[PDB]
Design an enzyme around this catalytic site. Structure first.
Site, short mmCIF file in Angstrom:
data_model
loop_
_atom_site.label_atom_id
_atom_site.label_comp_id
_atom_site.label_asym_id
_atom_site.label_seq_id
_atom_site.Cartn_x
_atom_site.Cartn_y
_atom_site.Cartn_z
N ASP A 142 8.53 9.93 -10.39
CA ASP A 142 7.67 9.37 -9.32
C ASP A 142 7.53 7.84 -9.47
O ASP A 142 6.45 7.27 -9.28
CB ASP A 142 6.30 10.07 -9.34
CG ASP A 142 5.55 10.00 -8.00
OD1 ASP A 142 6.07 9.44 -7.02
OD2 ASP A 142 4.42 10.52 -7.94
N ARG A 177 3.35 1.81 -6.18
CA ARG A 177 2.00 2.39 -6.23
C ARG A 177 1.62 2.95 -7.60
O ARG A 177 0.44 3.03 -7.92
CB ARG A 177 1.83 3.48 -5.16
CG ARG A 177 2.81 4.64 -5.30
CD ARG A 177 2.33 5.91 -4.64
NE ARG A 177 3.35 6.95 -4.77
CZ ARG A 177 4.48 7.01 -4.08
NH1 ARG A 177 4.77 6.09 -3.15
NH2 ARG A 177 5.35 8.00 -4.29
N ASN A 178 2.62 3.35 -8.39
CA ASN A 178 2.44 3.91 -9.73
C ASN A 178 2.80 2.94 -10.87
O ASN A 178 3.17 3.38 -11.97
CB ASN A 178 3.26 5.21 -9.86
CG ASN A 178 2.90 6.25 -8.81
OD1 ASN A 178 1.80 6.24 -8.25
ND2 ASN A 178 3.83 7.15 -8.54
N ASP A 185 1.50 6.46 -14.47
CA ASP A 185 1.65 7.79 -13.82
C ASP A 185 2.65 8.70 -14.55
O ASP A 185 3.62 9.18 -13.96
CB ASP A 185 2.02 7.66 -12.32
CG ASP A 185 1.86 8.98 -11.56
OD1 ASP A 185 0.78 9.59 -11.62
OD2 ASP A 185 2.83 9.41 -10.89
C1 LIG Z 1 -10.36 -3.89 -5.32
N1 LIG Z 1 -10.03 -3.36 -6.65
C2 LIG Z 1 -10.83 -4.01 -7.71
C3 LIG Z 1 -10.54 -3.37 -9.08
C4 LIG Z 1 -9.03 -3.46 -9.37
C5 LIG Z 1 -8.68 -2.80 -10.72
O1 LIG Z 1 -9.04 -1.41 -10.71
C6 LIG Z 1 -8.31 -0.53 -11.46
C7 LIG Z 1 -7.72 0.60 -10.90
N2 LIG Z 1 -7.03 1.43 -11.68
C8 LIG Z 1 -6.91 1.22 -12.99
C9 LIG Z 1 -6.11 2.16 -13.84
C10 LIG Z 1 -5.77 1.81 -15.16
C11 LIG Z 1 -5.01 2.66 -15.94
C12 LIG Z 1 -4.56 3.87 -15.42
C13 LIG Z 1 -4.88 4.23 -14.12
C14 LIG Z 1 -4.38 5.54 -13.55
N3 LIG Z 1 -3.32 5.23 -12.57
N4 LIG Z 1 -3.69 4.78 -11.42
C15 LIG Z 1 -2.90 4.44 -10.43
C16 LIG Z 1 -3.48 3.91 -9.16
C17 LIG Z 1 -4.75 3.27 -9.19
C18 LIG Z 1 -5.32 2.76 -8.04
C19 LIG Z 1 -4.65 2.86 -6.82
C20 LIG Z 1 -3.39 3.48 -6.77
C21 LIG Z 1 -2.71 3.58 -5.52
N5 LIG Z 1 -2.19 3.64 -4.51
C22 LIG Z 1 -2.81 3.99 -7.93
C23 LIG Z 1 -1.50 4.59 -10.64
C24 LIG Z 1 -1.05 5.08 -11.84
C25 LIG Z 1 -2.00 5.41 -12.84
O2 LIG Z 1 -1.60 5.83 -13.91
C26 LIG Z 1 -5.65 3.38 -13.33
N6 LIG Z 1 -7.46 0.15 -13.54
C27 LIG Z 1 -8.16 -0.72 -12.84
C28 LIG Z 1 -8.26 -2.77 -8.23
C29 LIG Z 1 -8.59 -3.48 -6.91
#
Ligand SMILES: CN1CCC(COc2cnc(-c3cccc(Cn4nc(-c5cccc(C#N)c5)ccc4=O)c3)nc2)CC1
Ligand SMILES: [Cl-]
Length: 265
Positions: free
Chosen positions: A125, A129-130, A143
């Site tokens: 995948d 996005r990932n 991911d």
């Molecule tokens: C406005 N806003 C302010 C805060 C910003 C930071 O926020 C964060 C969001 N996510 C993480 C995070 C860290 C480690 C692991 C994961 C898990 N993971 N998530 C995704 C994921 C996360 C968000 C949207 C999409 C989509 N489409 C995909 C993909 C793979 C995965 O493994 C998430 N850290 C910080 C973002 C912008």
């Protein structure tokens, strides 16, 4: 075993939902004085963990690593990625990265996949996005293992059952549903295209079902206007129909770093 971090160490801010998933939402955390991403798993669990535990052994600058987990819907602790996912960042009306920077992110993804390919791990995948970004603008291939989920359902079609990322999938996966490292190379091609269009949806005037017939007719995604030719030649080589003549990730790292090196900024 060492992966299991105690409950008194981890705080979880449930109001601050940073990501949203099928198996569970991703909430903000603070492990003690470091920032974290805490992924829930509400809705198999026994089977999911044994595959996930291998994640902890992996360490590479461009691959996401496991901090730990907390048992109690068990929570998965992951390093906080400040600038979010890579599809959201390149679209973000704030940061204006250069063509070089976008080629840099793609080179960084090539190295994350070269690593995982050397471990015989098929991502299945791979997409913008990932992939996440930290404070230093380092791309982390995410991911996989315990972090595995659907984070944006729009790019997954619902006979088979499990939802597939058709528009990122190679020709053999669309027909058979057998994923490989050379199939991951196809996906990387599509991801590179995302970087050069700054997070444009692949195949905008095409249905989720129809990509197999579309690709078989002899069609590929067009070259973006600011995509330098050599990189387009790479993108096309990744979509080679023989999942054999496609380039290895070690060749992708080599060729792309050459391309990256020819820019000013
Ligand atoms: C406005 N806003 C302010 C805060 C910003 C930071 O926020 C964060 C969001 N996510 C993480 C995070 C860290 C480690 C692991 C994961 C898990 N993971 N998530 C995704 C994921 C996360 C968000 C949207 C999409 C989509 N489409 C995909 C993909 C793979 C995965 O493994 C998430 N850290 C910080 C973002 C912008
Ligand atoms: Cl780089």
């Amino acid at each position: 075993q060492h992966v299991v971090i105690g409950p008194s160490s981890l705080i979880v801010h449930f109001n601050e939902v940073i990501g949203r998933g099928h198996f569970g939402c991703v909430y903000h955390g603070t492990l003690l004085k470091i920032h974290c991403a805490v992924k829930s798993l509400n809705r198999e669990v026994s089977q999911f963990l044994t595959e996930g535990i291998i994640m902890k052994d992996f360490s590479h600058p461009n691959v996401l690593s496991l901090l730990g987990i907390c048992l109690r819907s068990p929570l998965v602790v992951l390093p906080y990625m400040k600038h979010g996912d890579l599809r959201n960042f390149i679209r973000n009306e704030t940061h204006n990265p250069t063509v070089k920077d976008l080629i840099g992110f793609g080179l960084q993804v090539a190295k994350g996949m070269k690593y995982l390919a050397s471990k015989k791990i098929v991502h299945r995948d791979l997409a913008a996005r990932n992939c996440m970004l930290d404070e230093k603008f380092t791309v982390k291939v995410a991911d996989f293992g315990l972090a595995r989920d659907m984070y944006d359902k729009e790019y997954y079609s619902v006979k088979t059952g499990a939802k597939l990322p058709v528009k990122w999938m190679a020709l053999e996966s669309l027909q058979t549903q057998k994923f490989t490292t050379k199939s991951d190379v196809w996906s990387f091609g599509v991801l590179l295209w995302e970087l050069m269009t700054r997070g444009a949806p692949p195949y905008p005037d095409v249905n989720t079902f129809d990509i197999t017939v579309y690709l078989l007719q002899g069609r590929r995604l067009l070259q973006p206007e600011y995509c330098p030719d050599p990189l387009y030649e790479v993108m096309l080589k990744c979509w080679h129909p023989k999942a054999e003549m496609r380039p290895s990730f070690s060749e992708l790292v080599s060729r792309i770093s050459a391309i990256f090196s020819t820019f000013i900024g």
